[PDB]
Amino acid sequence: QGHMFEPGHLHLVSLPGLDQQDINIHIRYEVRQNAESGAYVHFDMDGEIDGKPFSDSFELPRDTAFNFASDATRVAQKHGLHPKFGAITRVHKEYDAMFEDIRAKLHAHPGEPVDLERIIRHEGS
Template sequence: MFQPGHLHRSNLPGQLQFAIDLFYEVRQDPKEGAMLHFRMVGEIEGKAFSEEFDLHRDTAFNFASVLTRVAAKHGLPTGHNLIMHGHDEYDRMYQDIRDKLGARPGDPVNFDHLAKDGF
């Protein structure tokens, strides 16, 4: 279930048990500028977790890859993508992030940010 600033995902009956909430917002960092702050909380197979991280404005659009890595770190197999390209939730979340960051096609990417954001 998606609503601006929040995505909730959970398993279907008969699948690996998980329930994950992802919250995101734009924050201004005095040194780095606009950052997309994520808070990911949930439970995977009965084990609770919580993690927060930031992505630079210009690298925030690779959020699905980062979310998959964070979820895998906490026990969700990588085949259970939290959000997939081409799905309505992904498209709506992507557009919401673009709107929140004021991003436009063709905006430059600072390659130093890629390393800082763990890519």
């Protein structure tokens, strides 16, 4: 499937038909607690693009943790992805699913809005 997401990690390869180039990236995110900001996320990105191996680590506090999708993509394309791939230029619709994972993880305990209220959310009769 090329690109894949799981709670704790994201896999990246380019699907055939899109761009025939050797891009392979691993994105690991582990929420750790620092005494500075409290909650924060430690990220690791590693693979080999155009055959060039890389190992990268970047950390964002709870305040800018949800800004990850901008930076994680920025560093990925700096390693040899073009916007034609749909790196930052693709509106990731499942970003909201990753987003809600990370906001619950930062809280440590889960807290996912059940859609039963969303059924009532309307106005007419």
